[PDB]
Symmetry: C5
Subunit: 274 residues, 5 copies
């Protein structure tokens, strides 16, 4: 796909807006029986015996949407090119709440321990699904069958081996389904993703402060070193993210991970391609 | 709503000054018996049983003022009019030095015979400058929280705007959970955040810091200026000759001897520079 | 006060050097009995009953000096005069290296048989350069605090300036609670902060860090310069040929064996570059 | 070598990609007997009596590869060399560290989640036209490292360390020419050499210090020096080196093992004329 | 001394390389030397006075480098840039020192962490030092032997030495002899030196250090002039305390690392 000139003319620029709700394990608000924990995992707890058999509710997964863009070609073609994005984690202020009814206290008579600890923040803008690389802390982990999360065993069609604690070139997938690819199993593949831009960070520790910023004045430019943004194949724009904001500390000692939604406003332009 | 050229002339630039005192829950210094806790919450505690029924005094809220600006147009019926355009702001959290006090009479000690635990832990800092009220998005930690009813003197929360009880979706982004920041000390911080899908005509800047005893780390200087112009060189345009200024500055917990903890906020000062702009 | 052109000619630039020793509460090294605690407070403790009646030795205060500058105008009744304009400063906290000492005889050991807990915790750092005294705003953690009443002109607190008791509004920003930083070691840091609504003719820069054992993290280099010019390229103009220099540098607690804790301060050095400026 | 002009022409620029798996002590995934701990050390403990006699599985080492480049010269004292000009590099598998439910993970408190991988971090990478020059320096010169096996100061000196090896001993030098063989706690990059390499690193100590890492495919490191010259690949070999210790796995018993992650590289190179 | 033009010529630039080993208290590896690059155990006594031993007083490292001789108007070497690096940073991943205090039962050793102090200086003459101490009642060993404030004053310290006493001044002219806890760079002098430093206090505060051979520090002042080497001597000074070694008993010792320098100098015309 050879990249030609930017299309000149009236309706050459467009804007795409959307938000993605977090897929922490309880992924739907519409199941009365368990939806009270929507945007959280269940309780995360080392079993103390082998092997680990994590349940789907304890496996935060990436959020993804494919956005359909205005059709460009009737019959060398025009493609939408993503050039910038404004993105924001929404609901940050909710985390000042230190009086959840079942919050573990910092000490006797004190306030709740605020949401804190492990953070994981990433977003990606691309013209096709984000490429994923599989790597796990423990290859002996027995993830649930797709029946359900997509894990390394799913893509290999056989059990993990010790090499899956490192980089196994065969352990690859595409982020093509919302709330189905666990964060603990899949990371962005730096060996591919030529047609995506991704940005991420992690923070470990149990009670490490959650420190986050928000402003409507911040823009990320999506152009590469040659001045070309992601090109949207088949008029589809892929947007991916994850925003783990820390643990909810419960009175019993039990802890669950929590996530927040993310907002996007992407600017695109028409580009001639060969 | 076409933006035209900047107005040229002698009195084309004006400077507006204000301060906003914090609205942490005890929101008035003038109450008969309870005002000693002005700029603080009451004691924040998990109930231990469901549901949470938090009191007003435990719900820090946004500060907001509308500033009336000099009237610009002798004829309001014209297509082309002059509007005040906010171009920069100098803003400072006031009273930062007060937080070196480690000898509050009822302060929990760091250890036996030691000084008090200094104000520390949860921080939340934000300010916004707009030509109209700041747009808010509702999202809460726990949808089952029973906030005091607005009709009973309570704050404005999600149930208020929906006309019905929250559902689990309000733990995520619900597009119906929206409001405008149009009342000082009535929109709880733990319920409302700036709405990034709107606010075309505002600029906002904010941060959070969680943890229980996390150091409060703040700077102050009269040399720092925030430029309010967007990518096109246009600042917020003041509709009806009104400038909207919003903020929140939670600076941490006061740790009391018994173990009880209350949040504390500080005031914020603003000096906004505005210029006259022709608009169609 | 119309600012004209920078003066041209041979000796149009001058340099002013000084240092300011900290005023932590024990403010003199020349007292027979108590001067061992020079650069420290006494022991800081919550009283445990109301009200707090803090002693002067527990109230770190701002340092300040007024430097007399060379006289410039033979005839002071002329409309157009030369004034010294402060354009840049090199400033440094002195004695930072002294804080590696973890073997002070009465230092609390971190754990059994260990090294002393080093000077750490609450930090407060600020400096200002101005052509007049720094403008101060009063705000306190607790309005019920009973600060010392003296006959010797210090410490000056909100009650001192108001001529009446504080009220709850003094936990926020009370526009009547204002003062000028015109006396060395007399204005308590926990009561007074720089007033961002004034200070047009000064530049100030500060920060706080709370927490009990938070690392003290400081830099020093003789290569760092602060430019004092505002947006128009004008520095503070020295009224009456006087340069005002103010600062505070609390660097943390000395943790004593008994559990007691005292705040500690370090001195600050300044080298200010000034130029002659025509003003009308 | 005197550096002449950048070669002009159609195929004067090439790209090289590769990944390096971590060599934390259990260095192979292909030994059914012990490979379950691949990318970790064994349990790290003070012996409690002198001397320390660490096992190889407790000595994280540098990763290294020599990448063979296309042959440039059919020959003359004037020739072409590959010049590395930029690199995109990324630590892979960062997301794996959100796992706080490893079956034998020490809990933060009763009934809580596992203590996340945290504590000691050491991160470095190097790109060079020859092996990275190493300087030896150890915490304790009386440490008895396993005989070569890992290469340590005793190996290169052909005699026992002395106290001077707790500081900089100019005799304690090596070249990073073998994957997984040079212990990190013994060897660091030698700033007195490495004219033909570029290296970047950091350390973080503490026991439970947050592991804080970033990843983006938009970040490029420029490898040109102050004269606009990148590393020049002697004998058409490109040397890539790294280490990425990401913290401790805290086990239920109290035991602790260090953990590492792999690193990816995409290096851009151009043809450069050189003399001698 | 009037600074004239930069000398233009074939051999007008030179590079000076050196390293300085740390002087933490046990300052020689050629003796007790098992503790080279460390202090002895640092421990508040609990009773007065404090009479610290010389092995518990980390001191600045310094070298005078003799430069190639060049000569009212003469040439001087002018230091224009430096690449400097703390050596041996990787050694600090060792959490299995045989006598290391454990983080908890069955755990690894507490890594080297806590108090850090990092500084370097490049000058055309000795670094100017200012004396200031935590406690004027500290009784430092007599010079026979570190140089301290009592050494320079010729009389005991008074309370004023907890602040800035303009009489408490010295020149950093001897390696391993000027205690870090007594002396700091004098910002009121040092016109012909450039210095850079930081401190981090705390007991177990993470040691966070960087290393790269791509980082350069420009030594030129605001007028484009670097330090000028009087009598053809370049002064290089540093200190790099990297934290505590935590021992099983509870005792703690400070530890330092060496520092490497590569200084670029050029010839400069000057007038005396
Ligand atoms: C928001 C507020 O005023 N909080 C008080 C708190 C309340 O008065 C509460 O309703 C009563 O506990 O009381 C605090 O002080 C306590 C005393 O009132 C009580 O008699 O004895 C307690 C210790 O045994 C304690 O001193 C509290 O609970 O900490 C103070 C707090 O500001
Ligand atoms: Cl993160
Ligand atoms: Cl914050
Ligand atoms: Cl500070
Ligand atoms: Cl690191
Ligand atoms: Cl430091």
């Amino acid at each position: 796909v050879e990249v030609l000139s930017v299309v000149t003319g009236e309706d050459s620029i467009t804007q795409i807006e959307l938000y993605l709700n977090p897929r922490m394990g309880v992924n739907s608000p519409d199941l009365p029986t368990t939806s009270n924990w929507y945007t959280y995992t269940y309780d995360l707890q080392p079993k103390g015996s082998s092997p680990d058999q994590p349940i789907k509710e304890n496996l935060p997964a990436y959020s993804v949407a494919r956005v359909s863009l205005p059709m460009l070609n009737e019959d060398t073609l025009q493609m939408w090119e993503a050039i910038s994005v404004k993105t924001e984690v929404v609901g940050i202020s909710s985390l000042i709440n230190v009086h959840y009814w079942d919050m573990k206290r910092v000490h006797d008579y004190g306030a709740g321990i605020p949401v804190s600890g492990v953070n994981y923040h990433m977003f990606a803008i691309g013209g096709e699904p984000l490429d994923l690389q599989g790597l796990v802390l423990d290859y002996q982990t027995q993830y649930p069958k797709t029946t359900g999360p997509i894990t390394i065993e799913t893509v290999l069609g056989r059990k993990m081996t010790p090499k899956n604690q490192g980089l196994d070139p065969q352990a690859k997938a595409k982020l093509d389904k919302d709330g189905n690819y666990p964060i603990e199993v899949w990371c962005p593949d730096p060996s591919k993703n030529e047609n995506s831009r991704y940005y991420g960070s992690i923070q470990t520790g149990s009670q490490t402060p959650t420190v986050l910023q928000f402003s409507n004045t911040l823009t990320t430019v999506l152009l590469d070193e040659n001045g070309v943004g992601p090109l949207c194949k088949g008029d589809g724009l892929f947007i991916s993210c994850a925003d783990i904001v820390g643990f909810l500390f419960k009175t019993s000692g039990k802890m669950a991970l929590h996530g927040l939604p993310r907002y996007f406003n992407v600017t695109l332009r028409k580009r001639w391609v060969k």
